[PDB]
Amino acid sequence: KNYADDIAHYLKQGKITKYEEKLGAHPSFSHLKNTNDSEYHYIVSMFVDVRNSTGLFKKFDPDVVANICRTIQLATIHTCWYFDGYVHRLQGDGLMVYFGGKGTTKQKAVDNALMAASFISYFVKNDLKNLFEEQGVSRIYTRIGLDFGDDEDTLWHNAGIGECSEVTTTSLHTSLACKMQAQAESNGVVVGDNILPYKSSDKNYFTYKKYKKNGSELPYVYEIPEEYFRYKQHDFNWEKFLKNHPQ
Amino acid sequence: GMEQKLYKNYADDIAHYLKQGKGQITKYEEKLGAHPSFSHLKNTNDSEYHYIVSMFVDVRNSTGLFKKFDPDVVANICRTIQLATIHTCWYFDGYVHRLQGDGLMVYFGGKGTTKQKAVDNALMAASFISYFVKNDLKNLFEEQGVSRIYTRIGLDFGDDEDTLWHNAGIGECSEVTTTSLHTSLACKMQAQAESNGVVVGDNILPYKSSDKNYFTYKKYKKNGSELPYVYEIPEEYFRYKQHDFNWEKFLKNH
């Protein structure tokens, strides 16, 4: 409520913490920095995009836009922290988050990521309802892409030079999490095939979605026929997820 | 010019990797998310208005590398492209603000740099990056059975009053960054570029004699339709145009 109240107040101005975790340095792999080493290890990759914030400039000055957007981003960061996510990178209009690590089970990683995605979407969709429309600006909404990559498919390593560097992954499923982020509905979440087995492949929460590409549709997000690899993406019903939960 | 031979080792490295299918001593000290002119804003509630050139560099089709290559080879290829891009930006006094998996965010300008110099640096860096990927990596990926990789660059200039530097995030989970229409519009225009193309905003043109030799006005594409401006605020009579930047002819005439 505090973030939503702050945002409402700012919109009236028309013209569990992890404070020591640095960016670009997942704690399970930060030791790879300043070395030439690398490790294969599973991870859940989540890309969060905040859409329509640029429209804020039509009615608000840069300082108010900064307050609104950084408030939304703080809400997102704290949501991720609550569910043991590591914030890897800050975009202007979103976040890159890893779930999992050396002391986390793959099931726990997936559950954490799904809960964090549901809560981020809830905050932006519901707790900020009508606030932007009431002020004559476009509604701000989120898009979240989520994927799971197993150890053999997820390479942790150094990238860059000097301090212009990060410890990050090279993995098809990190890339596909980003791609599926672009595929989501307003305040929606899209997940890859590898997420489903960790939630009993429930068509209760997951609905197969065709991959949209320049006004046309394709059956898969990614295809390697030589390996019989046909990767599907699925809309994640996070609202039904939240309602049908004990907590 | 320089670009014709600058990247020979990077191109050779990438060819070698593709055969494996299944400016200053303190630039090295520059952290991400911490432009040297504004890094002091970290851990503060302070902010400063100051111009900047915002550049977004996107590398497209690199995910296709996974169809034929293992993660370590994909990493070697992408890190080579990234290293060439970082060194290019440093040569033209760019500050690398953020590393993506498939691109970079770069600022040009700062407290001891003229706006003109910032724009010139950014245009030359964009031209050199585009030259490297389009020409020195020509055909290399197709020879090995993967899709051709190309770049897209969006460039914009924001003046002092329209560019707010401030802290974002909390604790160490933070960066010093800009809130500015023109940073956002540089990001937007990046998606508007042609393959190996550069798209710039209106504020870039006066710094290059608005030469239609180099700049071609282009409409903004959005869900199969076209609009005249990247951004419009009618109440301020603000109609912001985007332009293709002919970097090849730019390089030719230097």
Residue numbers in the entry:
A (entry chain A): 7 to 21, 69 to 300
B (entry chain B): 0 to 21, 67 to 298
Copy text from the publication.
3’,5’-cyclic uridine monophosphate (cUMP) and 3’,5’-cyclic cytidine monophosphate (cCMP) have been established as bacterial second messengers in the phage defense system, named pyrimidine cyclase system for anti-phage resistance (Pycsar). Until 2021, scientists reported that a group of bacterial nucleotide cyclases, which utilize UTP, and CTP to synthesize cUMP and cCMP, defend against bacteriophage infection, proving that cUMP, and cCMP are authentic second messengers controlling anti-phage defense in prokaryotes. This anti-phage system, termed pyrimidine cyclase system for antiphage resistance (Pycsar), contains a pyrimidine cyclase PycC and a receptor protein with either transmembrane domain (PycTM) or Toll/interleukin-1 receptor domain (PycTIR). Upon phage infections, produced cyclic mono-pyrimidines activates their receptors PycTM, which disrupts membrane integrity by forming transmembrane-spanning pore, or PycTIR, which deplete NAD+, leading to growth arrests and cell deaths, thus protecting the uninfected bacterial populations, a strategy called “abortive infection”.
The native crystals of EaPycC that belongs to space group of I23 were subsequently obtained, which contains two EaPycC molecules in the asymmetric unit. However, unlike BcPycC, the N-terminal α helix (α1) of EaPycC packs against α4 and α5 helices in the same protomer instead of extending into the opposing protomer. In contrast to the UTP-recognition residues, Y50, D94, and R97, identified in BcPycC, EaPycC contains strikingly different specificity-determining residues, F100, R142, and Q144, for CTP binding. Indeed, mutating F100, R142, and Q144 to alanine residues abolished the cytidylate cyclase activity of EaPycC, yielding no cCMP products (LC-MS dataset).
